[PDB]
Structures are given as structure tokens and as C-alpha cells.
Amino acid sequence: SRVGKKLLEIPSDVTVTLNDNNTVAVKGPKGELTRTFHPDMEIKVEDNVLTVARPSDQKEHRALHGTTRSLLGNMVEGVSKGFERGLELVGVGYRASKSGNKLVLNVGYSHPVEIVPEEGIEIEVPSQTKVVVKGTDKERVGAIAANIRAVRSPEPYKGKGIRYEGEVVRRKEGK
Amino acid sequence: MKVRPSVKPICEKCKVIRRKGKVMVICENPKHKQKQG
Amino acid sequence: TKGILGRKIGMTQVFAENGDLIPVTVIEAAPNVVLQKKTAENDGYEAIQLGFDDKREKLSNKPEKGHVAKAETAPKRFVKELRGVEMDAYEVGQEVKVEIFSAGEIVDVTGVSKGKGFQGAIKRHGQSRGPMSHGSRYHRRPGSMGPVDPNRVFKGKLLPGRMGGEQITVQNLEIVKVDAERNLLLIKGNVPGAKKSLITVKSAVK
Amino acid sequence: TPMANASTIERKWLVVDAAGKTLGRLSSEVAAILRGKHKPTYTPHVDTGDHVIIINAEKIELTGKKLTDKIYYRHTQHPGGLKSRTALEMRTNYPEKMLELAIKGMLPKGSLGRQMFKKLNVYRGSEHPHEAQKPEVYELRG
RNA sequence: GGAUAAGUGCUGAAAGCAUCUAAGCAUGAAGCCCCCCUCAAGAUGAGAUUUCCCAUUCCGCAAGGAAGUAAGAUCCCUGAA
RNA sequence: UUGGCACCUCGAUGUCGGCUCAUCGCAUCCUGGGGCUGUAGUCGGUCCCAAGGGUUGGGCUGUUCGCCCAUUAAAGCGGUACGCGAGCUGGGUUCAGAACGUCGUGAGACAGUUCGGUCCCUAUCCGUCGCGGGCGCAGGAAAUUUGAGAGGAGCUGUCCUUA
């Protein structure tokens, strides 16, 4: 029962590089990534497989040892497969569209709403309602998704507004 | 929120945690949501 | 950013394609001239000077004469300095005029208020007076000076003094008319200062 | 009946970098030498100290959550004229003055304290205009 | 505009899950610093820029002093915005 | 707050209320931002962060307080010698007069009432607001300026559209 103790294979179409002490850089079909890590940690890529180690056993080193592996797994999974998040939305006049790369939302306001994925992330609008964010970093993807969801967060009485596809909305009884 | 020094869990699904050195309580039931202060 | 400076004359009324009056202020800005063109490399900021007069040599002095003789103009009486404008546009010896502006541009104007003299708390600071009857021996006076505990008087307590003579700006005015042949501006409303006094006009700091 | 110096002084010029240093433990030495306690020819009333230069003031360090929680208060002589500046924004905008504050605080008070403060000359970065004085480096004992 | 409060969160382990948090990222107030207005180099840390004047005479070993001046300013006078 | 103790003050620390003048705290009345809701909406309740600014005019009463009328976004709670009388008033308390009730044999007395009843002071120092002079700022001068730093300002409704 431990995370960082484990190991992360590196299937193919991937190249890891310790550019320096800790500033890892990864590449592959979807693109590339970089991260700087805590230097007390120890990283060693073997043939096709990555290993991580900590010097010691403290509340700090343990946590870092777990986070580094989980984060690197996220990195390689993004560079291979990419990360994706769906978003539904529920209303009557609630819908979406795009202005080129941008996103556009006609939900509930006197005005529409505009969103800009500036950072090498793309957005897809297969339907008027459903939306997809698609990129390489879970961090940025979830960030953008929450930026969207904050626009018209749902309501409990009538489940409205933006809504993660796997969301369990709380409900009320409109008196 | 329910700000109070006597912070506890209420139901079994209530989950105490610590955050920014403060004590807090989590649950899907927002009325069970608590904090010290 | 833009700006000019001239002299106030007076006030009057003007119509606007209607019966709609306009209380107008009248300014003459004989063509101002550049004198110096400052830089961040030597002066630490970008800015220019502007002169507005044509003095007598009996009134001017040698250093002024040199400082202007960089340009091909005469000594000046009202010299001031504009900031935060386009610099490549301007040059030295370059005259600037009223046809900069137009009849709808908004403005922030600046001048020196009138001198009211050593006046009291009411006229200076808008305080209320005491009653003039019911046995009162108190009126036209500033008020208490404060409480007892600190054994002193706080700063900022307001009191008589030489009211006036302050550098004042007025924002978001509107130009009404121009007469470049007479070198005149006609501005919607009223400005600080007395007649014959300096007035620096500027593109409004929106 | 020992000596008590007067106009028999040779004030050198020292230089100090602050790339990773704690300002308190640094200042507690620079002030000592500004006062001249690093000399045998010390007297309390003559300012036997030695001139000091500090570089890379921005690049000082601190312990704990001081950058967020250490507060330099400063009051005018107006009511509610209290003002506050965190060590962080002091470091960014102007670390010269926060170094000066610390050192001034741990200097003596009076005309002599002020005059030995006047020897100090703090500079952001690594520029050091005072080449002409032919200074030298001073590593810190601490 | 910038940084923040409460709050919201993303990613994420310690604690194979969960977790707004310890690492790391972002939001977020009539509030804080700015933007706006005024004063401000006695800021004895006395700043900067432009332009003007010239480097005279007497003593005094020198130190330094006075004694006429330049640029310029004032006394005095007419007056008030 | 009502109080307890008697520590400074009886070679005098003027005491309620009101006027003018403000100032500080925040346990926030409004405005701002949020959580929860037995929050459908509109309005709300409660809690959290926030003290920047603002926070009415009248009748009765000496009054504070309070009740009432009409408004307001709101009509905040408190401290500053229950702020401020060498700044004002002096209606009340609290001198001497007189009177009612009551008590007292009586002289007289009553946090019982009523009528009427002298509020002094040329500001030395600090402090505050304004104004000048002198010197300094490694020569002497005229101008323009930088900006450390300081102060000011900083509130809010109603209507139309969205609908």
C-alpha cells in the first residue's frame, strides 16, 4: 500500500530527459512537457521503466515520493493519450458554440460569455450542450473545466448549468 | 458553514481534515460542513 | 496625450445648434512654443517644456535668453512642463496651437485658485456656525479642538488660514469652440483662477 | 590612562553580498563594524567604524512565514495614519530601506548613531558605484 | 490594474481511496498598494536637467582674511489678480 | 451599566443634557463579497470576511433613554474625564426667596413637586492651522522638475432595456 514506491513504464513514442538536477522533460506524439521537482528526491530511468526514491522517511519526503510518481504518470499518460474532460449543461436556452478556437456560451445572462484556451489546449463542441476540454496536463484541463463550470454552476432545485458528466448533483424540492 | 470551536463529525460520512492549520469537516451534506474560528 | 497652456480672460454664454445655452470660459493661447525636450537617459523622464508669453528684454535675463535661444524665440513668462505625451511628434522651436483640439474633446484643465486671504473656519472649511441667539456667545468659531486624554491636539484639525492660491484641476470638461485666428478656446463652464491668469489645458486623463 | 582616539582614523571600505543571508544575523555584524567594535582602537564617542557597502539586497533570505506575516508598521502623526508593509513587498519594491531599518534599529541612538549610519550605502543588485574608494570584501564570521 | 481576506477550486500525496495542502498552480471583495487630485529636496540622504557669470585686486610664508565687482537680487517707489 | 475598595485629587480635577468640532474600535445598520438554509422567485434568516465611505428631519419631554409622524440604502453599538464649559448655552440638578402635600410640638426637613434665580480669565510653553525671516545643501545665480514621503477623495438611490 504505497504510491511512490511503485514504478512507471514508458511504453514507446516517449523520451524522458533529466535536463539537469530535476527539470524533467518528456516528449511524444501529443507533444511534450516539463516539470521541476524537489531536489532531495532521486529519480532514475532504467530501460523502459522509471524508478523513484527518497532519502528518508518524514512527513515531507513520503508525500513528495508519492506525488512525484503520480504526477509523472499523469505527464506520460497525457503525452501518450492526452487528458479529456466532458461537460454537460442543462436548461432550455442553454447552449454553446465557438468563435474559432474560442468558446462561446449562451446560457442565462443578458450577455453571452466568451472563453479562451490560450495554452495549447483545445475545446470541442460535438453538440450544442455537450463540451469537451482536451489537452495534456490534468492540472490545466481541470482548471479550464472549473473556469467553465463557475460561469453558471448548477442549481439544486432544477439541475441547471454546467455539469461534469460524472457529477452527482444535489437536489431540493421547489416549494 | 457552521463555524464553531466544537467541531465534530455528525454522520459517519462526515470526514474531519485539517487545512491551513485549521480544522474542518467535510461531507456531501453541506449542513455538516464545519470549521473552527 | 496632449496639452496646451494659455491665459484666462472671462466668461460668457454660447448657444449650441439650439436655444441651449452654454456657460463658456474664454482662453487665449497665443501659439505656445517648445523650449526643451527631456529624456529618461539624462532627465529621468520623458517630457517637454512650453512657453507662453512674449516678454520684454528689460524683464528677461541672460540665462532665460540662452535657454530659449536654443530655439529661435523670445523670452517667456509662463513656462511649464508636460509629461507622458508622444515625444517623437514634437521638436524644439516647434509651435503648438489651438487647432490641436476640436469642438467636442473632453479636457482636464488646471489653474491657480483666487486668493481669498486669511479667512475663518466656515468660509475655508465649510463648518457650521453656532446659534446667533438664545444666549449664545459662540458663533463663527471652529469648534472644539478635541478630547482630553491625549493632552494635545490632533493634526488635521481645521482652522483659519490663507484660503486660496492653490493649484486646482478640473476634470472632464468639454471644449465648445476654437478660433485659431484669434488663438482662442471656448470651454464649457468655469475654471479655477482669476482673469489674466495662467491656465494649462490637457487632454483629459480618462 | 589608555588612548582615546581622535582624528587618527583610517576608515576602510568593505563590501558584503547577501545572496542567501538572513538580514538579522548579517546586520548584527555590519552594525558592529560600523560602530568599530572590530578594532582595538575603539572608543564609544568617536565613530571609529568602517564604511560598508551591501549588494544584492533583494536577494536576502528569511525564515518561516515572515514574508507573508512580518509587518513593518509606520505611523504618521495623523489620526488613523498607520500604515503597514509586508517584508515581501518591501523586498521587491525596495529592500534597501528594510535593511536600513534593521541596521538602524540595532545601531545606537543619538547623533553618533546617525553619523555611523551615514557610512552605510546599500545597493540593489551588484553594481557598487564606489569603485574609487578601492574597497575590499568582508566575509561574515557568522 | 497588481497582490490578497472569507469563499471557491484544479492537480496531488502523506494515509494504494478520498482530500483546496504539505510540494506546486488559479481565482476571489465598496477593503490593501496603485491608477485620480493636492503638498513635497530642511528627503541635513539636502536630488536631477537647461541656461548665465568669471576665476579680479590687496594682504598674508601658507592657512586664511577684506574689498571692490560680474551674472543676479534687493532697498525705495507705483499698484493689485 | 448597577455596584464593591478607597489608590491620586478637598492650599478646588466643574457635575446632566444640548450646540460646534471631530476622532478611534468593530461585537457591521446600509453598501461590497461569500457558506448554509425548513434558500422555488422577489423578500428573507443565520453565519463568515470586511470599519473605505455613509449612517435623516420633526412632535412630547430639561432631559439621556423612550413613544409617536413622515422618510431613508440604512436611520449601528460603544470609547475618548458617561469626549469637548480657559470653545458656547445653562433648561435640570444643587445656595439664599416663596408656596402645595406630608412629617415634626417647634426651629425646619423631603432622589416629593412648583415659580424665580450673577457661568470670570489680555494665552507664557507644548500642541494645531497659516505665514515670513536666517542659515545650510563645497562657487555664485534664474527657471523647470523628479519623487521618497504626506494629505485629500473615496456614499447611494430611482427609472428603461435585458424581460
Coordinates of C-alpha atoms in Angstrom, one line a residue, chain C residues 7-8 11 13 16 23 39 42 63 67 78 85 108 162 170-171 184:
Chain C
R7 CA -4.4 82.8 -20.2
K8 CA -7.9 83.2 -18.9
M11 CA -16.9 84.0 -19.2
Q13 CA -22.8 82.4 -22.9
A16 CA -25.3 75.1 -29.5
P23 CA -21.8 78.9 -19.8
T39 CA 14.5 62.2 -21.7
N42 CA 19.5 62.4 -18.8
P63 CA 20.0 82.6 -18.6
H67 CA 17.6 78.6 -22.5
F78 CA 4.8 81.4 -18.2
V85 CA 2.9 62.6 -24.2
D108 CA -8.8 68.4 -17.8
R162 CA -4.8 81.9 3.9
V170 CA -11.0 70.4 -13.1
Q171 CA -11.7 67.2 -15.0
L184 CA -8.9 81.3 -28.6

